[PDB]
Design a protein around this ligand. Structure first.
Ligand SMILES: C[N+](C)(C)CCO
Ligand SMILES: C[N+](C)(C)CCO
Ligand SMILES: C[N+](C)(C)CCO
Ligand SMILES: C[N+](C)(C)CCO
Ligand SMILES: C[N+](C)(C)CCO
Ligand SMILES: C[N+](C)(C)CCO
Ligand SMILES: C[N+](C)(C)CCO
Length: 311
């Protein structure tokens, strides 16, 4: 809905001039969309820009006041003629790098030899977050890289690999909502269920989020590191109680012999018993270590080689 002007080539740049004024920011001109920056120079290729459509960065010329406004920035792709690529699905394009973005018409730069598939949202920006493609989940980076002032938006929209936190994010991370961990393999596919990574087991479940703490999977209990997710084995002191986890990770219940020493792990909860306890109508005594007293006396009461109380 911008009309009555014309494109002008001047000083190795391209402008759109109407009634003697230069177009700035976003314009829809004769069925195509262009962006002319803060002083009129038409952009080409990859651009990280304030979102169009509100009116505050739209249909504006450089003789008009430019409002203060807070708008998220997103990645957009423009042709070499300045026309916005109005894609809402996906398209293979030159990879955005440090040397092919923020360019204007008239500027020379190398087209990336590397091409990648970029995904787009319904408003022609590069899509971020979770997408489902041909039977798998992929994560498109919502965030760029930080480095003490050094924000680089380049990784946004790119396929994530490896260990990745899914933050709630608009302009910035919302550090009040949860940010679960995921693991994407070498092609970006989200892993589920049990996976061994850097020598340790993790459980990602059906939804892909990395489990922490206690988790019941296929009829057995496992303990994943409360912070780091890695699966524990052996004896573990958790919540002021000992538990014994097999080499497979599965929690033990009932009687368990470590070397010569017997321990009793509570039938349901799995916690190691100490003191006097009953099992199937028999009395047994475990020391503070968990070790079953056998062939000896305890507070006047004697116990046989099975550890059972004898009258
Ligand atoms: C990761 N999923 C998209 C599979 C679900 C959680 O948002
Ligand atoms: C959960 N991670 C393994 C990704 C981080 C460990 O600190
Ligand atoms: C041994 N795990 C149970 C940890 C995974 C493979 O079955
Ligand atoms: C039963 N466990 C203690 C093993 C898990 C949390 O209740
Ligand atoms: C069961 N004993 C009688 C052995 C001790 C009391 O708990
Ligand atoms: C770990 N415990 C203290 C339960 C016994 C030593 O194996
Ligand atoms: C003999 N115990 C009762 C100690 C355990 C194995 O049966």
């Amino acid at each position: 809905n911008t009309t009555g002007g014309r494109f002008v080539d001047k000083d190795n740049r391209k402008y759109y001039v109407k009634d003697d004024h230069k177009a700035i920011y976003w314009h829809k001109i004769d069925g195509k969309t262009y962006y002319f920056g803060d002083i009129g120079e038409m952009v080409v290729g990859w651009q990280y820009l304030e979102i169009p459509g509100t009116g505050y960065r739209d249909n504006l010329f450089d003789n008009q006041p430019v409002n203060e406004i807070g708008l998220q920035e997103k990645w957009y792709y423009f042709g070499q003629d300045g026309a916005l690529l109005e894609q809402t699905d996906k398209q293979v394009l030159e990879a955005k790098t440090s040397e092919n973005t923020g360019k204007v018409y008239g500027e020379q730069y190398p087209l990336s030899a590397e091409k990648r598939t970029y995904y787009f949202d319904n408003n022609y920006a590069v899509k971020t977050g979770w997408i489902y493609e041909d039977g798998n989940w992929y994560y498109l980076n919502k965030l760029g890289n930080f480095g003490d002032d050094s924000y680089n938006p380049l990784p946004i929209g790119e396929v994530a690999k490896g260990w990745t936190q899914d933050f709630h994010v608009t302009i910035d991370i919302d550090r009040s909502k949860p940010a679960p961990w995921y693991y994407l393999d070498a092609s970006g596919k989200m892993l589920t269920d049990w996976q061994k990574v850097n020598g340790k087991w993790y459980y990602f479940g059906s939804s892909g989020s990395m489990a922490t703490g206690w988790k019941y999977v296929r009829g057995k209990w496992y303990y994943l590191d409360n912070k780091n997710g890695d699966m524990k084995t052996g004896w573990q002191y958790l919540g002021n109680k000992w538990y014994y986890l097999r080499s497979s990770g599965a929690m033990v219940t009932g009687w368990y012999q470590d070397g010569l020493t017997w321990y009793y792990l509570n039938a349901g909860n799995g916690d190691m018993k100490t003191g006097w306890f009953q099992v199937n109508g028999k009395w047994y005594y475990a020391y503070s270590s968990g070790a079953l007293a056998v062939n000896t006396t305890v507070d006047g009461y004697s116990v046989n080689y099975n550890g059972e109380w004898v009258q």
